[PDB]
Ligand binder design. Sequence first.
Ligand SMILES: *[C@@H]1O[C@H](CO)[C@@H](O[C@@H]2O[C@H](CO)[C@@H](O)[C@H](O)[C@H]2NC(C)=O)[C@H](O)[C@H]1NC(C)=O
Ligand SMILES: *[C@@H]1O[C@H](CO)[C@@H](O[C@@H]2O[C@H](CO)[C@@H](O)[C@H](O)[C@H]2NC(C)=O)[C@H](O)[C@H]1NC(C)=O
Ligand SMILES: *[C@@H]1O[C@H](CO)[C@@H](O)[C@H](O)[C@H]1NC(C)=O
Ligand SMILES: *[C@@H]1O[C@H](CO)[C@@H](O)[C@H](O)[C@H]1NC(C)=O
Ligand SMILES: *[C@@H]1O[C@H](CO)[C@@H](O)[C@H](O)[C@H]1NC(C)=O
Ligand SMILES: *[C@@H]1O[C@H](CO)[C@@H](O)[C@H](O)[C@H]1NC(C)=O
Ligand SMILES: *[C@@H]1O[C@H](CO)[C@@H](O)[C@H](O)[C@H]1NC(C)=O
Ligand SMILES: *[C@@H]1O[C@H](CO)[C@@H](O)[C@H](O)[C@H]1NC(C)=O
Ligand SMILES: *[C@@H]1O[C@H](CO)[C@@H](O)[C@H](O)[C@H]1NC(C)=O
Ligand SMILES: *[C@@H]1O[C@H](CO)[C@@H](O)[C@H](O)[C@H]1NC(C)=O
Lengths: 370, 214, 346, 50, 198
Amino acid sequence: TLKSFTVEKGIYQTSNFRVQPTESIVRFPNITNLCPFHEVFNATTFASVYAWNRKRISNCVADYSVIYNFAPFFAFKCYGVSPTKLNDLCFTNVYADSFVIRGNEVSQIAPGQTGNIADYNYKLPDDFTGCVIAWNSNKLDSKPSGNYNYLYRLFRKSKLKPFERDISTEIYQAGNRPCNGVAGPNCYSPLQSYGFRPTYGVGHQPYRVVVLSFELLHAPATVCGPKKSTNLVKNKCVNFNFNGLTGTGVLTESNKKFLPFQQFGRDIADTTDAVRDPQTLEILDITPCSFGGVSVITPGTNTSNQVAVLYQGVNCTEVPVTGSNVFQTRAGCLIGAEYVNNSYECDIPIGAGICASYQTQTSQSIIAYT
Amino acid sequence: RTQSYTNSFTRGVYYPDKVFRSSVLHSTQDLFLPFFSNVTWFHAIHVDNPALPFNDGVYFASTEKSNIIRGWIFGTTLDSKTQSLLIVNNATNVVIKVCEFQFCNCTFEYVSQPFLMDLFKNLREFVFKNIDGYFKIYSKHTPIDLPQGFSALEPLVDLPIGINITRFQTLLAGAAAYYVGYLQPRTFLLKYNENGTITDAVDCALDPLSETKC
Amino acid sequence: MSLGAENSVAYSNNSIAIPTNFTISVTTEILPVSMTKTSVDCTMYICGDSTECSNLLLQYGSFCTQLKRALTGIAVEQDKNTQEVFAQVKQIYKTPPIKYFGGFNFSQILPDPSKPSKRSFIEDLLFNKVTLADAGFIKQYGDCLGDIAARDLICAQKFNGLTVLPPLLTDEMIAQYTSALLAGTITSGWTFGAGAALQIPFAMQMAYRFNGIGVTQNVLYENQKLIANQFNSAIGKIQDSLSSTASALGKLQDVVNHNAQALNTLVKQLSSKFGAISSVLNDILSRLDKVEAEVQIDRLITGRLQSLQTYVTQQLIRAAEIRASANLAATKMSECVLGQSKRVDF
Amino acid sequence: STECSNLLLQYGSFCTQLKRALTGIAVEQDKNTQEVFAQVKQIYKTPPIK
Amino acid sequence: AARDLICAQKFNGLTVLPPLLTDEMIAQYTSALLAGTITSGWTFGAGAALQIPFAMQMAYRFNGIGVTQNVLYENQKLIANQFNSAIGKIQDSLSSTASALGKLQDVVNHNAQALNTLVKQLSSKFGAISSVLNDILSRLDKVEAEVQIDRLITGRLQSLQTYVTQQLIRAAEIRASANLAATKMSECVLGQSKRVDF
Ligand SMILES: *[C@@H]1O[C@H](CO)[C@@H](O[C@@H]2O[C@H](CO)[C@@H](O)[C@H](O)[C@H]2NC(C)=O)[C@H](O)[C@H]1NC(C)=O
Ligand SMILES: *[C@@H]1O[C@H](CO)[C@@H](O[C@@H]2O[C@H](CO)[C@@H](O)[C@H](O)[C@H]2NC(C)=O)[C@H](O)[C@H]1NC(C)=O
Ligand SMILES: *[C@@H]1O[C@H](CO)[C@@H](O)[C@H](O)[C@H]1NC(C)=O
Ligand SMILES: *[C@@H]1O[C@H](CO)[C@@H](O)[C@H](O)[C@H]1NC(C)=O
Ligand SMILES: *[C@@H]1O[C@H](CO)[C@@H](O)[C@H](O)[C@H]1NC(C)=O
Ligand SMILES: *[C@@H]1O[C@H](CO)[C@@H](O)[C@H](O)[C@H]1NC(C)=O
Ligand SMILES: *[C@@H]1O[C@H](CO)[C@@H](O)[C@H](O)[C@H]1NC(C)=O
Ligand SMILES: *[C@@H]1O[C@H](CO)[C@@H](O)[C@H](O)[C@H]1NC(C)=O
Ligand SMILES: *[C@@H]1O[C@H](CO)[C@@H](O)[C@H](O)[C@H]1NC(C)=O
Ligand SMILES: *[C@@H]1O[C@H](CO)[C@@H](O)[C@H](O)[C@H]1NC(C)=O
């Protein structure tokens, strides 16, 4: 630590001890069904962008590795979450929406992105912890005469605020003249069809897009990945994977009175302290296992080589275990030095009226004294 | 109708999250009832216009001991033209509906225990809000007008409906009396006890003493 | 605001005014000496048993060796401050059993063996008045490993690598130093500050001090009883003033409150995001793949290093201020307890 | 600005520390002026003759 | 048309608080401490003021420096003339040279130049593309505007922390010099000094 080949007489602080974890415990909710992603992805037709279909996915087990088989898409690019880490931790509710757009409008379905579709057809929130899957469908959703099945909205009296859908169609009033259901000069139909031809460019081809909106925290989990569970253990510093919330600490019985809608217990420093078991409704306190500072007490290298270790601030009735002499202080306890009833001047300090020295005994050793 | 105004005092505080916290002071920013505001008192007597706007959050209260209030109808308009929210509770098991039947698309039928566990004064209190497609329900039963005490309301029932609501009304089985309070975005400081129940609170934008406390 | 009461001396070039009577008064003064010694572990604070954060921190730089060296120097400086202000006497004196010092009381100041700690009445009142917190390693990781319904801040600051070192000199040897200095001042006078202690009764010592201040020593031996009664009444008034008002030890309470507030801010700093998506290292390493988690961990590590630099710099400035106050206390102890000082209002 | 204040709120209590320190400096100068100059209890007055 | 820097420091959120004691109240304290030394000697620093003429008041202070009091009473007019000549000479010395007040000028100049270099650093870019917030929120959308705002906030917070640290060190130095001034005021005005060259 001191980056030197010789050290002088005195007390030195070097490192810290930590009790290593023993085993691994994984606790997941008891859900056995399989999520119908195939029904979402293998569909004959998709609804329009102004009338997008929303599917609720809950109370099943989701396999995210089978999505690459269903659709030949480019990539699975996501905000806040990674593709590769989906199967380990797990969520509460899954929202799946599917609609069809042009090639120019793929870039504006994003958090914080505005435009035409984002202002009038489908708007994403800024903290949107989900993502999209887009792929070309020029061989299915295109016709030589033109596929006129899909519509979009051009005019609206306000902008879109997120996760809302407009169904009713009204003739827009672009001037002071009222319309009253008549398409006049300043009155226009709110919907226009998509012109989809196979002879068009790649920027105007039809695209089948599916967005997967995922919800984080609260709402005790209904959908989780394919990882199996593990039997619960208590009073041991072990690893735990509780609903995807990993950590390291001591699992123990707790007497806290959680409300029935509450599942997590937070400390002052924004750290999980009390946890709810997903299998059975019991409350467990999470405390990290024992650690502390380590002090090295030594004389000079020119004098001797014998070293006494001070375990800083921890009781050594539970020390993770170096000689045979143990003396207890207020600052901790001392290993490798005995205790004498003599009273000398302080050669090297420890704290709380304890001083060490290198002295004769018969014959040279490290003694501690008041 | 008998439109009357009474002091709301300090009867609009609820748990803003589903996280247990013990003996800590946490400051949150959420839609809330301002302290010492005015609520609207109605004496709905039938042998009156029940048209009440939403205005981003509805605080509902009822001091009626008997189970005479049945449910609430929500939505934009009630003409069987657009989507409207139709909580009906027949005092046996509550039924939630998304359909727009005139004086009887998610279609979320939540058939379980009712929202009205009550059989002293036995005041009832409800807080309704809609942020990110979610109509929340907070409810408490306080055996005690508005008393000088605190009662933290709990998120007992959640609704993933995702519709748009502007106009709401009440339902009866004529001595109806209820209080309507409005919600505005504000900053609170909430005091948790050692048991995890909110016992003290302060508004951060009411008084310079309260702003100094915040 | 009023600057004070008005006064006007009727001055003329033939008028002198001399006193005809005196009054002995006792005045207290409070000075800090030391503060709470702390030490910060980087890897348990910034990371909290995460290997990727430790790899990024060892890739980052060598700031933690500087921080640990600075905090160790502050701790050694605090021990030096207490050693310099208190241990100025060479041999630990003891009081004689006979307590007749010319009619003076001398009972609230000398210690009594009835208490387990050899502490007098006024030291007991001073220790009872201060609402002391974070004494040292009085916990020894025993209560924090147990379960408490209302978790205090102290277990949270112990679990995040922020320890409080106990002082080298505890309360009993400080009380023994003060008892030795009182025994030397009462029996020997100022002669124990120069060489060995020379015994002298209290009346000739008070005559020595009156001859020092400029009054002929015949005034004392004709007014011994009045001086003794005024001294006893002044000690009683000082004891009543400490027993009534609890707002007299504001500087020491300010020192303890400053250290507690600094450690509370250092603990509560980890609740923020610093521009990252989450304040938990485990959530970042579990939700993301390698590169973006490295980006978020880089932002969090930069923010936590900035916070720790701010805390260490503030602690160094406070250490310099308390060292200056301790040096003033040490020279006041050297020039006023061990002798008679002629400087006006020192 | 509102959104810049929102992004500043993601940082911790840095500005709570800095505003508290300068207030502690600003209270200290009054103590210095009171300690140096106000060392006399009563406001004295010179005689009219000089 | 010629705008001063005081208005820029005013609108950029850098207020300056007034002192509690005004210029008149310090003058009354100094006049009172002059009225205590002339008409009472060092007796008003210990207990209550005692009336005493200036002849035995000057004759007391020669006994502190080892000269018997007959020297003053045999040489009073010469001492009075020398005191008046010294007062006139130090009045002319302060009236002629304006460079004697170098210590009190630096206290103003340090704080003025520190505020001036704090205000000037807002024109820096701190790794962004512009020194104006409103330009980059009129031009860029929020996804990378958040990153640009984060870079600007990091630079401004670093500059503010540097300024607060410099203010803390300067206040500690001024506190030490003020305690030295306080003990000099309490020892040399309110009484006589046996400390040589104090
Ligand atoms: C100097 O002051 C003391 C006060 O401490 C005077 O003592 C008082 O004398 C009166 C005489 O009537 C008594 O009633 C008081 O009880 C005494 N007080 C104390 C505390 O003993 C003393 O007399 C004064 N000296 C002179 C010469 O008058
Ligand atoms: C010295 O002062 C002490 C403290 O007041 C005196 O002790 C008290 O004397 C009164 C007088 O009867 C008693 O009522 C108290 O109970 C005593 N207190 C204690 C703690 O003993 C003492 O009398 C004074 N004189 C001497 C010579 O010691
Ligand atoms: C699921 O959870 C635990 C797993 O052992 C079991 O006790 C419980 O009965 C199970 N419930 C169902 C409905 O499978
Ligand atoms: C999708 O799955 C169905 C089975 O339900 C299958 O008939 C069809 O060929 C698959 N592919 C497409 C592109 O629909
Ligand atoms: C250490 O442990 C022992 C027994 O386990 C206990 O009696 C003691 O109080 C503990 N603490 C200290 C400081 O010795
Ligand atoms: C609430 O409204 C009524 C009618 O406008 C008014 O009289 C009353 O003062 C209001 N309450 C307040 C301002 O607290
Ligand atoms: C929603 O579904 C219900 C189910 O019967 C139906 O009555 C209602 O008309 C639907 N609303 C629409 C399609 O807007
Ligand atoms: C609901 O409809 C109103 C118009 O009545 C509109 O202003 C608002 O933006 C809509 N969306 C909401 C509240 O999310
Ligand atoms: C917390 O709950 C216990 C259990 O009955 C109760 O005795 C105590 O009074 C409660 N605390 C408060 C502050 O009411
Ligand atoms: C004393 O003061 C008076 C009043 O001014 C003055 O006339 C006189 O000359 C002074 N000196 C003596 C010795 O009286």
